[PDB]
């Protein structure tokens, strides 16, 4: 059994953010409750509302219920979040989350299963995808026979960004740095992979860079300076 | 907030800690249906305790629930590096709502101090071009997690340019952070040798890159 969040990382504000979950591994119209949880900077989770996979019976949120929609579709598997007239305060990362229950009013239900999480960020600024630059490799700071190399992701805004290698065949050693942020409203961000220096220039080395929020894809070679 | 938690906790390594969640009578006190939640940093909450004291196969012994009236608790035993995380217990409230506490965010005191490693890297070529120039050094592998980074020109001081990560935990429980100089290329190739000091626990590390 899996969820899956998708949705833009990026909504205006006064305007509608729209989440979808894809459940996989069990059907959506079976005995549970399918949950919205966000978790704004900071603050804690908060539970947003449910759909009854039977029955399709909403419950809401108190303080949110005049500003939430969940729908769920039995086709395609999936159920959906809607929140209006957003605001910085909604900022958030978006899980959705499975409910498993016995008998409600003796014991409630919990969340066994979550999807991963969805960065949903609420700023008027527009879309701007990374620039990617090498980070030629460097043998002073590993153990001997090996050295350092890496991709500078470069001024990108929203977050987040994903780095693999090699296609995620390459996973041994790998280290992606927390984002910084700069005054100029972007974001940048290193990954970094020690490899042995014998295959420098007999192995090829590429980062996969994952830009969702701006829907930009890099596959970016790092070379030794010539 | 609603379900009221504390702050944060501190333990040592080994020792048990006790996280408090205090609800209601239309909460926790109306149910056998409090929840904790496990949340590390980049992953989604992991379920611990549910139904207030069961534990879902693959939850550790370590952890147990209990309630008593309107609080509900969680302990964990022998403490480990691995346990520092946000806590979270919640509960499905009385008409058909669901409510969480605000968080608790676990401290494990005790690790083996770890000095960084550092990396620095020089502009790429292709920057360069652009007529900017971004110095990137990497801080890996250092505990307590508290660094302070200081960049030179020629032995001179920078101020300006610079942008500093706070430190985050690493799989292996050390701690990672990075800072970044923004230059011109100008800038970059004016200066015979650009310095990354790293200073951790009295101790600093000083690597230089050269155009």
């Given at each position: 059994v899996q969820l899956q969040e998708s949705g833009p990382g990026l909504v205006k504000p006064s305007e509608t953010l729209s989440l979808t979950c894809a459940v996989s591994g069990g059907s959506i119209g079976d005995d549970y409750y399918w949950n919205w949880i966000r978790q704004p900077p900071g603050k804690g989770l908060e539970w947003i509302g449910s759909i009854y996979g039977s029955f399709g019976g909403t419950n809401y949120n108190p303080s949110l219920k005049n500003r939430v929609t969940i729908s769920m579709d039995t086709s395609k598997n999936q159920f959906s979040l809607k929140l209006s007239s957003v605001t910085a305060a909604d900022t958030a990362v978006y899980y959705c989350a499975r409910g498993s229950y016995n008998i409600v009013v003796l014991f409630g239900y919990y969340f066994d299963y979550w999807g991963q999480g969805v960065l949903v960020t609420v700023s008027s600024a527009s879309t701007k995808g990374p620039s990617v630059f090498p980070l030629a490799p460097s043998?002073?700071?590993?153990?001997?026979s090996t050295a350092a190399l890496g991709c500078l992701v470069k001024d990108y805004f929203p977050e987040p960004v994903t780095v693999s290698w090699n296609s995620g065949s390459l996973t041994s050693g790998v280290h992606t740095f927390p984002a910084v942020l700069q005054s100029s409203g972007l974001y940048s961000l290193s990954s970094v992979v020690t490899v042995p220096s014998s295959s420098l220039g007999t192995q090829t080395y590429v980062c996969n860079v994952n830009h969702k929020p701006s829907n930009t894809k890099v596959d970016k070679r790092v070379e030794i300076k010539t | 907030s609603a379900l009221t938690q504390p702050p944060s906790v501190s333990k040592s390594l080994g020792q048990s800690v006790t996280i408090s969640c205090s609800g209601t009578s239309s909460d926790i006190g109306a149910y056998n249906g409090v929840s904790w939640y496990q949340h590390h940093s980049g992953t989604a909450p992991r379920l611990l305790?549910?139904?207030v004291s069961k534990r879902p196969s693959g939850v550790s012994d370590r952890f147990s629930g209990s309630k008593s009236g309107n609080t509900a608790s969680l302990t964990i035993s022998g403490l480990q590096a691995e346990d520092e995380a946000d806590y979270y217990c919640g509960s499905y409230r009385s008409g058909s709502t669901w409510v969480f506490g605000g968080g608790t965010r676990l401290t494990v005191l005790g690790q083996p101090k770890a000095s960084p490693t550092v990396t620095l890297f020089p502009p790429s070529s292709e920057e360069l071009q652009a007529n900017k120039a971004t110095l990137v050094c990497l801080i890996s592998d250092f505990y307590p997690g508290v660094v302070k980074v200081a960049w030179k020109a020629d032995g001179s001081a920078v101020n300006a340019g610079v942008e500093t990560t706070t430190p985050s935990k690493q799989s292996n429980n050390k701690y990672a952070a990075s800072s970044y100089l923004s230059l011109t290329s100008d800038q970059w190739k004016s200066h015979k040798s650009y310095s990354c000091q790293v200073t951790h626990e009295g101790s600093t590390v000083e690597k230089t890159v050269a155009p």
């Open positions: 043998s002073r700071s590993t153990s001997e | 305790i549910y139904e």
